Amino acid sequence: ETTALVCDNGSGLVKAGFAGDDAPRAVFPSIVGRPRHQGVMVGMGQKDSYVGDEAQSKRGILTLKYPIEHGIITNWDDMEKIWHHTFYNELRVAPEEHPTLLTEAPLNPKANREKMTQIMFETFNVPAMYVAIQAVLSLYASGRTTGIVLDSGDGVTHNVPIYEGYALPHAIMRLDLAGRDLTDYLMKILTERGYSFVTTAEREIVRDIKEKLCYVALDFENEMATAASSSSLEKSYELPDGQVITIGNERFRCPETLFQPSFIGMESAGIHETTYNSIMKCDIDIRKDLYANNVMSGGTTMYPGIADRMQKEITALAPSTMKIKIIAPPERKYSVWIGGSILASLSTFQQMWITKQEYDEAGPSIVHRKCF
Amino acid sequence: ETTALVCDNGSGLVKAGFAGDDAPRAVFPSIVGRPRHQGVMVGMGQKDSYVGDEAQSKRGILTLKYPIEHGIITNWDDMEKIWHHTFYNELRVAPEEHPTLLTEAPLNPKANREKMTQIMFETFNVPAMYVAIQAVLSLYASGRTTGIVLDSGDGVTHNVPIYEGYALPHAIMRLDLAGRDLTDYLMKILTERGYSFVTTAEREIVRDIKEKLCYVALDFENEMATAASSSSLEKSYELPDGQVITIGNERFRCPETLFQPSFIGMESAGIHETTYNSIMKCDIDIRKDLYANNVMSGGTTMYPGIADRMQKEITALAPSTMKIKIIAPPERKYSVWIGGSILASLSTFQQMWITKQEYDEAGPSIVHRKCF
Amino acid sequence: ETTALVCDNGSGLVKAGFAGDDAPRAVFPSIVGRPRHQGVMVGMGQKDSYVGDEAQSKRGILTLKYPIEHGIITNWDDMEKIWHHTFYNELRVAPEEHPTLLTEAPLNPKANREKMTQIMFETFNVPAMYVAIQAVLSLYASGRTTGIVLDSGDGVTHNVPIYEGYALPHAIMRLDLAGRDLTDYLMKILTERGYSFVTTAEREIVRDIKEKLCYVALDFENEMATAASSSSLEKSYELPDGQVITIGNERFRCPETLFQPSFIGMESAGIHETTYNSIMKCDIDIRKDLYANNVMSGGTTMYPGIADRMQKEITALAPSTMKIKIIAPPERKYSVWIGGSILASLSTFQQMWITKQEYDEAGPSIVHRKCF
């Protein structure tokens, strides 16, 4: 087959499509949903498991399980359904033709990458495949060969410093604070204004609140004082069922978890200090070009004001001698997939696939030598 | 001063009394009752609206309104009647003398705590007051500095991990399943044997069936098989009017809702998995002491067999390499009030009251900085 | 006078006790711990900051800060707590009466030794003190007067050639590779089996995995091939909370960092080439007697098999004409402290103390002329 698929099966929201396109062919929630009520209508297409946009649409009668937790596949029985849906339902291409570029977060369990390779060769029969790292693909989308990626998906936030083509694996920082945990924190603080959301169906409404209204404050303490001179920062959101909810300092006190992880009680650097600590693990001659080439990526980097709050805080930690030149491109909602759509299309990369003939003499253990 | 009041105004049943006593001075249903019928006997001590034990006694002619719903006050014009009845009709002390310890569930709406504080300083003029969390009070009655409190009242079930006197707010759980919804579910399943209860007056009779006859099965399917070798589990309850109702397996299929919330259709973990999911959100080194000091509280944990059913299920979820122990003292029906009666008595606590002299220069917003 | 203290203020784990005793009186983690959660249990011995074994025990609610980083005191406001705790809590002796032998790594910053001297004379008022080198103390514990000391603690690894009483400061080596960076790497490889240790308390669990289960392979690639006949090398450890983790090639691939620092991405010789380079920088006639008397020291030299891997590697680098006889004594967990407990006892050492009556006519600058 001439064309590769690239299939960023990432947490919360899969991206999939052919290499050499400039955007994903399909994007849908990485959700398998199962009925939670007594079926009664005989004579109907009643179905035992919905997946993707079917599960997102019918959700008022479903329990929703994401099969991926913090970038690790935790429910293979349902992860086969998400890949099966991805290839047979709306890409609608037989995997026996197209080789496929998958993608993984850095510092994942080796057992995940093995079992992921096995399913692709033994349930889908793809002629060849590869497992690039979510950060390394982002520099191809930016057109760079040096930078520090901050990638922050639904399930994981991570940094991978890269200089003039080489990744620095001792300086990789992985943090499990991401777009999911902000959604659970928003379900928690909305309780203190009197709105209760608790079902896995209602968590999707709280995700739509988070996406439509949140922003990152340029200076959180001054913003908290500004919300006490109240009603200038408040917004209304219109729930399904048409009840409005009004939302105030909890509009920006949600994304500030990224800069102050003690709000969700976990002990870590915020995303500003984790990027700065990663730059400070790099060899001293490269740091000037890492500060000049700091690259945002992944859906959590879409909030209004996050490029400014990030630049403000790295500029406070770094010496005033030199300039942080953060790049937040407008496509960064999909830049990992766009990166894989370049990588799978390179003429030099066609040597690097794991092929069916190279797998079956080596088993799923092959993936650790030929990949990152 | 000789005394302070402590006043657990919780859902379904207020507990009230002076600090330093070893049990509540007054206990009554948190009910306001309004005549639903044509008055005819002119020249009588007739009354516009009853409350507490008056309403509970005269209930056959009253629509009964509980002014607290799921731990949130939702009828302030009648909640002032419950506090007024508490302080003037059977504690019978002028509130202007005594500072008062109120009480609240965790994750309650901030608007509740504000308006509750305002009523206390502006309608009753109390010298000082405070609003402790129902879980934090529960450990003082047990004397422990560490444990996971499970508390389950009429209106709310919640868990609060506490270690070495520090609470973990990121690991708190709240579930809107409690002694009310088990009474509403018991009304429903009794329909299937032939008994119909529908009025807010009759619901108090179903609450007596629940309190007098229910228990938690140690192994639910084995107990359901035991009800097919029938008539060994049946009990007969004598209603007001003297009609007898035999109650069969619904005697234990009611309380089992706590361990399977899908019976009342709500999507959540039961109270066993909610306890274990709270412990699994705590920092790893404390979990051994939380498994050793699981503390029960609130009237819904009074059922026969619930300490054993809980110990069995937590011992199946937790790793078998360590002992799980659950402490369920015999006075746990009042341990939240007993805890407040200790907390208000401490010589080191007398700095922490919100005093009238601090409220009238900061407004009801004061309560969020001095309380939890 | 019966005593002088010897107080090896080392990184990771302070050793302290009176001179002439044969092992440290007190040994505890060099840690200050600060609460990271909301305090609720009023009426308790609730302490603003814990230190040593208190902090190590209560760690599940603390952020743990080691004040000593790579052998440098980086946080004086907390290092004074560790020395105050060391002298007043379990040595429990008035510092105003006992002279104290402190200790330092070779090639430390002068500002470290100055401020360390000032605190002892101006906060604790000690009558006299001295600052020996961690390596120069180690020869007294073995009883040598010639031998290249290799010492490897929590924070620093260094070599100090000594011959017939004289040190060779042009041939001293110091490397920021030690028991800390082995632990920080063990978290980063345990991650690839799926165990997500990340908090400053969970690093203490990973340190126990390191101390309990690690060993140094005699032939690394051959041991990595032996891991393909799997489960023969695996061991399992039971965490706090009772979960069991199995650990495999990541059991010995951790300590191999000492012999291949390129694993953690720094560029240097491994500790075998650091010894052979340090001997090869000595004057040619002493080398035969240095190879014959290589002396090991400090907790990171405790691993099973490290003496054999070292003797193998020096015997490959050094000419086959002569024997290497690496003397690793069995108490080398404490040889730096034991060496000081000899040094402070000698009748010929008592002329060399820096004394309170000499410090206040020269300032902290005295310590650069009267010590090494």
Ligand SMILES: Nc1ncnc2c1ncn2[C@@H]1O[C@H](COP(=O)(O)OP(=O)(O)O)[C@@H](O)[C@H]1O
């Ligand atoms: N406009 C937006 N603003 C902020 N967050 C967004 C926005 N659009 C989507 N998100 C969040 O992005 C997350 C998905 O990010 P994504 O990059 O697709 O994750 P992943 O890389 O792991 O596949 C979800 O939590 C979602 O709510």
Ligand SMILES: Nc1ncnc2c1ncn2[C@@H]1O[C@H](COP(=O)(O)OP(=O)(O)O)[C@@H](O)[C@H]1O
């Ligand atoms: N002996 C009992 N056995 C079973 N249930 C009880 C018992 N006593 C009270 N309850 C139930 O517990 C609830 C009252 O619990 P309570 O602790 O007073 O609630 P709250 O903490 O919110 O004030 C009611 O639903 C009541 O029927």
Ligand SMILES: Nc1ncnc2c1ncn2[C@@H]1O[C@H](COP(=O)(O)OP(=O)(O)O)[C@@H](O)[C@H]1O
């Ligand atoms: N038995 C052991 N096996 C392996 N590592 C050990 C052992 N005992 C101590 N360590 C490690 O050695 C370090 C402490 O060594 P120590 O000699 O006390 O350091 P220092 O000289 O700087 O004071 C810690 O990283 C600890 O985990």
Ligand code: BEF
């Ligand atoms: F899986 Be996404 F990268 F968090």
Ligand code: BEF
């Ligand atoms: F208000 Be009770 F605690 F349910």
Ligand code: BEF
């Ligand atoms: F401070 Be120890 F010597 F690393």
Ligand SMILES: [Mg+2]
């Ligand atoms: Mg991603």
Ligand SMILES: [Mg+2]
């Ligand atoms: Mg209660």
Ligand SMILES: [Mg+2]
């Ligand atoms: Mg040392």
